[PDB]
Design an enzyme around this catalytic site. Sequence first.
Site, PDB file in Angstrom:
ATOM      1  N   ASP C  55       0.769  -1.146   0.063  1.00  0.00           N
ATOM      2  CA  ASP C  55      -0.201  -0.004   0.086  1.00  0.00           C
ATOM      3  C   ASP C  55       0.855   1.135   0.110  1.00  0.00           C
ATOM      4  O   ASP C  55       1.964   1.273   0.576  1.00  0.00           O
ATOM      5  CB  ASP C  55      -0.969   0.001   1.196  1.00  0.00           C
ATOM      6  CG  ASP C  55      -2.047   1.087   1.328  1.00  0.00           C
ATOM      7  OD1 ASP C  55      -2.855   1.261   0.286  1.00  0.00           O
ATOM      8  OD2 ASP C  55      -2.038   2.011   2.263  1.00  0.00           O
ATOM      9  N   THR C  88      -4.037   5.564  -3.111  1.00  0.00           N
ATOM     10  CA  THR C  88      -2.930   5.864  -2.200  1.00  0.00           C
ATOM     11  C   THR C  88      -1.538   5.299  -2.660  1.00  0.00           C
ATOM     12  O   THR C  88      -0.598   5.282  -2.178  1.00  0.00           O
ATOM     13  CB  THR C  88      -3.228   5.675  -0.860  1.00  0.00           C
ATOM     14  OG1 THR C  88      -4.282   5.954  -0.335  1.00  0.00           O
ATOM     15  CG2 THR C  88      -1.963   5.989   0.162  1.00  0.00           C
ATOM     16  N   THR C  89      -1.474   4.779  -3.874  1.00  0.00           N
ATOM     17  CA  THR C  89      -0.409   4.704  -4.663  1.00  0.00           C
ATOM     18  C   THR C  89      -0.571   5.307  -6.119  1.00  0.00           C
ATOM     19  O   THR C  89       0.171   5.947  -6.635  1.00  0.00           O
ATOM     20  CB  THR C  89      -0.064   3.170  -5.089  1.00  0.00           C
ATOM     21  OG1 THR C  89      -0.301   2.198  -4.176  1.00  0.00           O
ATOM     22  CG2 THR C  89       1.198   2.828  -5.727  1.00  0.00           C
ATOM     23  N   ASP C 392      -8.446  -1.472   3.256  1.00  0.00           N
ATOM     24  CA  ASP C 392      -8.611  -0.711   2.035  1.00  0.00           C
ATOM     25  C   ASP C 392      -9.880  -1.128   1.208  1.00  0.00           C
ATOM     26  O   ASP C 392     -10.532  -0.661   0.380  1.00  0.00           O
ATOM     27  CB  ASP C 392      -7.469  -0.682   1.223  1.00  0.00           C
ATOM     28  CG  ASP C 392      -6.157  -0.309   2.036  1.00  0.00           C
ATOM     29  OD1 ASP C 392      -6.388   0.403   3.039  1.00  0.00           O
ATOM     30  OD2 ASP C 392      -5.143  -0.074   1.265  1.00  0.00           O
TER      31      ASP C 392
HETATM   32  N1  LIG Z   1      -8.500  -6.308 -13.055  1.00  0.00           N
HETATM   33  C1  LIG Z   1      -7.750  -5.042 -13.320  1.00  0.00           C
HETATM   34  N2  LIG Z   1      -7.671  -4.839 -14.616  1.00  0.00           N
HETATM   35  C2  LIG Z   1      -6.959  -3.810 -15.070  1.00  0.00           C
HETATM   36  N3  LIG Z   1      -6.484  -2.738 -13.999  1.00  0.00           N
HETATM   37  C3  LIG Z   1      -6.771  -3.071 -12.822  1.00  0.00           C
HETATM   38  C4  LIG Z   1      -7.391  -4.186 -12.414  1.00  0.00           C
HETATM   39  N4  LIG Z   1      -7.368  -4.128 -10.890  1.00  0.00           N
HETATM   40  C5  LIG Z   1      -6.813  -3.329 -10.602  1.00  0.00           C
HETATM   41  N5  LIG Z   1      -6.561  -2.487 -11.482  1.00  0.00           N
HETATM   42  C6  LIG Z   1      -5.688  -0.848 -11.386  1.00  0.00           C
HETATM   43  O1  LIG Z   1      -4.705  -0.998 -10.532  1.00  0.00           O
HETATM   44  C7  LIG Z   1      -4.668  -0.046  -9.982  1.00  0.00           C
HETATM   45  C8  LIG Z   1      -4.360  -0.153  -8.224  1.00  0.00           C
HETATM   46  O2  LIG Z   1      -4.346   1.136  -7.611  1.00  0.00           O
HETATM   47  P1  LIG Z   1      -3.832   1.245  -5.955  1.00  0.00           P
HETATM   48  O3  LIG Z   1      -2.524   0.970  -5.905  1.00  0.00           O
HETATM   49  O4  LIG Z   1      -4.780   0.368  -5.317  1.00  0.00           O
HETATM   50  O5  LIG Z   1      -4.349   2.888  -5.779  1.00  0.00           O
HETATM   51  P2  LIG Z   1      -4.345   3.185  -3.960  1.00  0.00           P
HETATM   52  O6  LIG Z   1      -2.958   3.069  -3.610  1.00  0.00           O
HETATM   53  O7  LIG Z   1      -5.024   4.635  -4.197  1.00  0.00           O
HETATM   54  O8  LIG Z   1      -5.178   2.191  -3.432  1.00  0.00           O
HETATM   55  C9  LIG Z   1      -5.838   0.965  -9.920  1.00  0.00           C
HETATM   56  O9  LIG Z   1      -5.585   2.077 -10.395  1.00  0.00           O
HETATM   57  C10 LIG Z   1      -6.554   0.217 -11.247  1.00  0.00           C
HETATM   58  O10 LIG Z   1      -6.996   0.701 -12.450  1.00  0.00           O
END
Ligand SMILES: Nc1ncnc2c1ncn2[C@@H]1O[C@H](COP(=O)(O)OP(=O)(O)O)[C@@H](O)[C@H]1O
Lengths: 146, 147, 537, 523, 535
Positions: C55, C88-89, C392
Amino acid sequence: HRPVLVLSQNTKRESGRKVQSGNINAAKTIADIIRTCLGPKSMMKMLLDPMGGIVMTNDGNAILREIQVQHPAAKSMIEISRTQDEEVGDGTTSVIILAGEMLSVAEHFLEQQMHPTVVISAYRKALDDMISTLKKISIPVDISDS
Amino acid sequence: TSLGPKGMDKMIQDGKGDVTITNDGATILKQMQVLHPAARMLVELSKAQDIEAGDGTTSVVIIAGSLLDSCTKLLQKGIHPTIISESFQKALEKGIEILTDMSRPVELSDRETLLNSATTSLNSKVVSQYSSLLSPMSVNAVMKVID
Amino acid sequence: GPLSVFGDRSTGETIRSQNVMAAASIANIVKSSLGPVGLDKMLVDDIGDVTITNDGATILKLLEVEHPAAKVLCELADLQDKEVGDGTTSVVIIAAELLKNADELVKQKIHPTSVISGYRLACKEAVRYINENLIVNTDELGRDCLINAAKTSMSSKIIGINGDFFANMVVDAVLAIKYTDIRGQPRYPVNSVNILKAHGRSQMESMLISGYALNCVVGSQGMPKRIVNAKIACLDFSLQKTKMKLGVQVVITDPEKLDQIRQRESDITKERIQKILATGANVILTTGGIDDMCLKYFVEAGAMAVRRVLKRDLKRIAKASGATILSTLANLEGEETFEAAMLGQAEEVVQERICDDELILIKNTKARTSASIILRGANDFMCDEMERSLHDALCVVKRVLESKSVVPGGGAVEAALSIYLENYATSMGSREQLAIAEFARSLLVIPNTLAVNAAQDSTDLVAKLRAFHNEAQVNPERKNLKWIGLDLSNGKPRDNKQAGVFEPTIVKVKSLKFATEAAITILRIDDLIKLHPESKD
Amino acid sequence: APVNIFKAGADEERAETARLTSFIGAIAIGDLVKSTLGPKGMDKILLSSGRDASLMVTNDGATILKNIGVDNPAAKVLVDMSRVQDDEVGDGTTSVTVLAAELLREAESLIAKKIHPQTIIAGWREATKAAREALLSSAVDHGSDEVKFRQDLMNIAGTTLSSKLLTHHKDHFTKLAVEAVLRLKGSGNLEAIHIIKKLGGSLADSYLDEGFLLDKKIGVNQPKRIENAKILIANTGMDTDKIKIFGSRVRVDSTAKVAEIEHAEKEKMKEKVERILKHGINCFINRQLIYNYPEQLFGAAGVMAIEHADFAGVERLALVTGGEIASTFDHPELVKLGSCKLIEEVMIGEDKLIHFSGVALGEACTIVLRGATQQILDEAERSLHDALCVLAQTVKDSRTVYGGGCSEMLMAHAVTQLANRTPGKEAVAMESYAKALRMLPTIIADNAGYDSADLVAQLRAAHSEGNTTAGLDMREGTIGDMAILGITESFQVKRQVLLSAAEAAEVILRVDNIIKAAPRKRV
Amino acid sequence: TLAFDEYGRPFLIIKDQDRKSRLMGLEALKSHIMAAKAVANTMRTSLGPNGLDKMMVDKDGDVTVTNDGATILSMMDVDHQIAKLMVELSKSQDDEIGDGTTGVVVLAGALLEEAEQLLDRGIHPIRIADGYEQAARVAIEHLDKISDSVLVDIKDTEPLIQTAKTTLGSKVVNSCHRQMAEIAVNAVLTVADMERRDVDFELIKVEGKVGGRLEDTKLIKGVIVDKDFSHPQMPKKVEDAKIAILTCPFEPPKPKTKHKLDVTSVEDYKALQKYEKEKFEEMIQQIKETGANLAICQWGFDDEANHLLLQNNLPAVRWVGGPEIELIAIATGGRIVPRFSELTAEKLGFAGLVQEISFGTTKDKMLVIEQCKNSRAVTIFIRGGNKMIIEEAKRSLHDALCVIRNLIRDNRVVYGGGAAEISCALAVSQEADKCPTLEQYAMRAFADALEVIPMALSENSGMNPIQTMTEVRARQVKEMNPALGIDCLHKGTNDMKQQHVIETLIGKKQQISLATQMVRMILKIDDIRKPGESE
Ligand SMILES: Nc1ncnc2c1ncn2[C@@H]1O[C@H](COP(=O)(O)OP(=O)(O)O)[C@@H](O)[C@H]1O
Ligand SMILES: Nc1ncnc2c1ncn2[C@@H]1O[C@H](COP(=O)(O)OP(=O)(O)O)[C@@H](O)[C@H]1O
Ligand SMILES: Nc1ncnc2c1ncn2[C@@H]1O[C@H](COP(=O)(O)OP(=O)(O)O)[C@@H](O)[C@H]1O
Ligand SMILES: Nc1ncnc2c1ncn2[C@@H]1O[C@H](COP(=O)(O)OP(=O)(O)O)[C@@H](O)[C@H]1O
Ligand SMILES: Nc1ncnc2c1ncn2[C@@H]1O[C@H](COP(=O)(O)OP(=O)(O)O)[C@@H](O)[C@H]1O
Ligand SMILES: [Mg+2]
Ligand SMILES: [Mg+2]
Ligand SMILES: [Mg+2]
């Protein structure tokens, strides 16, 4: 004496193949320690304590608790044997050898430009099929019999 | 470089570790902690502008930094510094009469006049893109508590 | 001559190049932990503690920073947990690429105030475009929207299985804590779900306890550890011997009156314990302390007494079981009344086995039917990762049920905003059009990072990604290509409407508002003065 | 230049500490040798920290300043000023140091008066021009009537030796200094008067030798005294000649020819001595060393042989005997021989010296200084050197002025008379020039313990109306006539005190910036 | 960040970059002006006839009081590369002209001080440097307006004496302001080739000896060397000298190669004695057959040859230097002879009073040559009270020997005392309005910096700078501009033509040309790459 304009002072950074293939060798190193303590022809392993005592044992849990490691992936394998010691009794040495061998075959696929999420998604599908196999080859026990 | 609407802010990191971003001339000079004794009088000059006017802080250092810079050629002409102090007062007393002719008498009941005055001071800060909300809130927070 | 400050002064394009490398030092760390093909990291401390997490908030909080432009991006990740909770990434990579493209503009002798004013015209237009190009609210999809939005958050973490085991436990947890408010506000407080950790069996044995799971022990080993049809008595006062206060002292003048005062310290103590136990109460929860003399009255009467519970755990039990949190005696100059009609209710209070520890469970609580999740992992490093990934995931379904609006994930929002803002910069752009055009290229780093971590084609998959989004804006023939994303397991653009890749609206609205506002403050460090540390004087 | 200093280890100062360090460093030099001025001033003893310290007491101001090693930059100008005064006239090195320091002390009084330093330079140039006419118009010439010129020469040596260690020896050391220059009868070479210092005896036991003294006694088997001899000196090589052909060997075939060559070498060395005794001489002086083979030849012929006297020892023997150097012996009719009466050896302080008694054309002298310690002999040699150098220039310039404070009040009167005919810009600088000229009789009067505030006031009142020969009487402590008491100094000595101090004070007063560089091996 | 990358790798570009110093900023130009103004403010007090001297101390402890701008900046330990260019600027004026070494540093510091206020207004530093070239071109063409001299080197030496009095008026030789000025005029005209307009300073020997006074400095037509008569009974005065200049030592002839001469019998050893005895009689007779009565030899003498000089009445000196005997053959008209066999009556030199003079109590006995016959080499004998006044007079009179050399190269003069700087400042101000397109502010900064040199003369003379300069500059506009400057005692009126303050045209022509080009090399620099500590 002017300070050096740095960022994240006095810390290390390491990524790439040196961490994926580096945690495999730390898991293979612990599995080679207690490899001679699984069968009935095993031998004891005399250990020395910082208090001055001596732990002469061949159990896989009591050996790994007396080992202080500096590698971060090596600290994960010691907590695995602590989990097996609290859940069941004789479920210690077998998990450390098996987790070292499942990571031994996992290092082969990381060299083939395969993503680690593909191996884990194949490991979770294989884990769900190992539970169903043991329940088919099981046998009910008469607990009233001495 | 921290004056006007096209000016940029400065960040001063102290020895404790509390780094703040500042654009007002009074807040910059109090955090720089200049060791020169003649430069510490320019820090207290911007402090009294924050007390009396509040919106004259960076400009009082540009004027006083240039009035002394204009005295570099004046002291290399055999002019005594008491003669420069007499002539700077005659330019100061004539300077207020020029600014009084440019002044226009306004009334506090006109909200459009008070709105354009507060929007000018926000153009130099980081809230120049938020002048559609902070500048109406600055007038309504004053004209309701002054009677 | 020069400034006589005792610190250090650096002006010009030196700090303007140092702040970009300070922001890129943070973004290049968290770029390897984005998306379903992202991988976790290791955070080893000097004392020997190891923290395995992916995270964006847990990594940057434990990592030490020194640069003032680095503390802006680290505190930007801490704000995403309170405001949204999973976002939060992606905010850290966007806010650092907003400074990387603006550094290329200020090297072209473009004034940074035009870049700041150019970013505000592109940030407000990005929120305007995302609020007019949503698919549907939570009425058409129903329960399929809550499960598919939960699996998108878990794909970047350790609980991203192909099944729906962890997805169904999160939706059944938020739907069981629906707390209504005034003026029609169905609030979902996700902090009331007690997330517990225990090194036990695999992740498929994670129990969904309908009720509450108290993390405490019974204490004395003479009490019944399972009470059926229990009546919970929630109270906060120490059940110890009656100790007088500072203003009261015992000054005796007669030796015959000595032993009656000594027995009075336990008689007043046991007088409270007999009037709270004769009303049918079987379970007593205490945040204070129950000493060894008072534990006898629960063993003799056959009642359970739990001592030294948390104050945050007592409020979640008394609100869910209908109990009243009582601190002392009350009710209009009464000696000992206790208001026995205000006792809690529970179906079963049972202390189970949690792999060599004691854990107390309350079943369905008879008043509100709350929920608590007990996680099961291999070691303590997985249990700390499973707790952060579950928290989360609880914040995703909270924002969907509150704000009934979802956007397609997987780079579908950043592809549509990369082409709409280029056409927006051409219409009303005279001098700030270069900042709006670089706002679209900075948003393209989110689908670019998904192609790097998947080891797929980079400059061809994203080029095929924006090919469908360009035809959805310039060819009005109802192409419905606004939901085109990325299939990282195959390497081709897919439709996120049918695939079930859903994200909440405010996980990208608040991300674009926080990253644009953070990029303005770091853009105004043209002058920087660093003083010497004042430690030893 | 102090603000934003662009120097590595060097420092500087401009108009604040430049004239401050120049006035402190120059007054402290003049106040050091202030106690050594006059006929009643004390002397200094100079010592080092160790490692052959070699203590040397001197009263002359040049020898004090040349050994102290002052670290001040402006003080080295006054040290070098007194060095030229000792090399040109040999007297007044202490008087030129106090006068140059009293000018800068009066110039320090013009700091608070806000006088421009270029106005003080222009005011002192007109003051020095008025002071040159005071000494030139008061100079007393001496042409014929030589019985008054020899009496005038004893007043010069009596004035110079009164300010030295030879206080109560003016009845003897004046005759040792006047008759030494009077026997030169020509140019003042100042090297024919060879001063020999021997321990034992008092200063009254010292005398002027009528002949000449030497060392390196006469051979081994040679006569010690020859009456009515003909002295021939030489500057040639006697033995082991290796005569002027570099790269010449003796390449023979047998050892019998080596015995013939070394006998032929000794025959040519014998033939060289046979060319010397054809002149008909009895004494031989060689500047180089005489080995054993020509020494036996002079001893067999009854001829003296003085070997390796000195490089300048054959020059004094050529001026005291009337011969020539004669380094080549091939023409006896073109070599002039010396003349003497007795070449007996005398013993002075348990050391046998060769006394050339009764020489003809003796334009060289030998002063036999005898003292109680070595410190007295080193002081009496420099005291006699300060007296012989003035008498060697008094015979070249017979103009004399009245010393003892009389010459300084004549110079201060001519400046004060022209200070009243000037506007007020330069008149204040001329009055400070006249006050520094009156300090030179004030230092002399206060060193004896007299009332210096009243005696210089009586000298200023005397010179204001007549009394061109009135000066300071240090014998009784009053004001007397300098022509009656006989206290006179040379004109060229008193001119170089006035002129060199006015030029040296011009340099230091014109300095507004002292930029000293970084020294080497000083950390 | 510095010394580290964003990926954690060490970021090392150059070696020892932590101990480096680099400034581009906006203060890199400001650091060059503040380093150059402190050099110009130091040299401002040593300008003009009221200029105060400076005391320089060497590394060995030697103290030299200097006033000329060439020796002041050269004897500093300034480790600043901007101020090191001001040292080479004063050295370039000394090597070419040699009169305005002090004024070329105050002028260069004045152009940089006026460019400091122009830099804050937003003008590019090369645009100021391009504006100074268009402004200095007006000062060169305006300086060639009034220029005339009537020097004929026969009887009209009056413009030559008054030109040297302007150079010697600022030094410490003002006591000999008329005596020493006539020395430097006659020393150049006797050695200069008027057909080629070339002056050789190797023919002018400048010697100094302590003793006497400044008024005893005489122009000795001939040579002054250290006389080293090997015989103490040599005659110390020759009335009519037939000088025999030779370069062979008085010895038997030694070859340049290895010989190892073999002697076998006693007849060969007796032949060695007769070879050297006839060689010393041959080297003495070959001088006496030419009619010579004086010999000069570069190398040493033998003891056998010393007495043969006294028997034949032939005085001779010993161990003369290299270029010293080169000056004897020109002053006496003789030829330097390598051997003794090539001596003849035509290779002899002619001289008059040849004598040695003892100075006080010393043992130097320098040569004095009174009479000569059409000599092309002179020697100035500087005397004084100490070595501080002699080494400065060697530097002061060398500046007086250079301004007479510049009059033979170019016979055009100007009028100093600040008169030429005020007149050139009006020419730039008149052409600043024709046209004030871009470089109007750069030309007015040039005219305001040209007025620093006359206002520095008003500051050192106790006057007021802005009061005196406004009066002189206004009088040149109301009428036709005369030679109007200032002075210390002011000599009554301010007319430089009546006060006879005459300076060379090419002296002030190189003051404006060298100070403009040195300003252009210190304005066209935006980075400093100096190291940190020494080790
Ligand atoms: N099944 C999927 N197919 C394509 N992209 C995905 C899938 N699942 C998640 N993602 C991408 O992975 C990213 C994960 O972001 P994340 O690190 O969780 O953000 P944060 O740090 O704010 O929680 C998201 O922006 C999303 O677009
Ligand atoms: N008689 C036997 N024959 C074959 N295998 C045996 C025999 N006895 C024990 N083993 C094997 O030895 C292993 C010992 O495992 P052990 O190290 O005790 O596990 P744990 O560490 O969990 O206690 C068992 O897995 C068992 O299969
Ligand atoms: N819209 C605008 N257009 C032009 N100039 C402006 C505008 N708004 C502000 N300024 C200028 O910016 C300057 C800001 O000065 P400021 O730093 O606020 O002074 P102080 O430090 O005394 O408060 C003002 O002098 C003003 O002239
Ligand atoms: N008999 C005397 N009467 C008066 N004054 C005397 C007498 N003898 C010496 N003096 C004074 O003493 C001073 C001694 O000066 P001195 O130290 O010898 O100078 P310097 O060191 O230059 O030789 C002289 O200036 C002289 O005027
Ligand atoms: N009599 C005088 N009146 C007015 N000015 C004078 C007089 N004599 C000299 N000056 C000025 O003094 C200045 C001395 O310059 P100087 O330091 O000699 O230059 P440099 O160092 O190149 O030799 C000259 O520029 C000249 O104008
Ligand atoms: Mg403002
Ligand atoms: Mg004396
Ligand atoms: Mg000059």
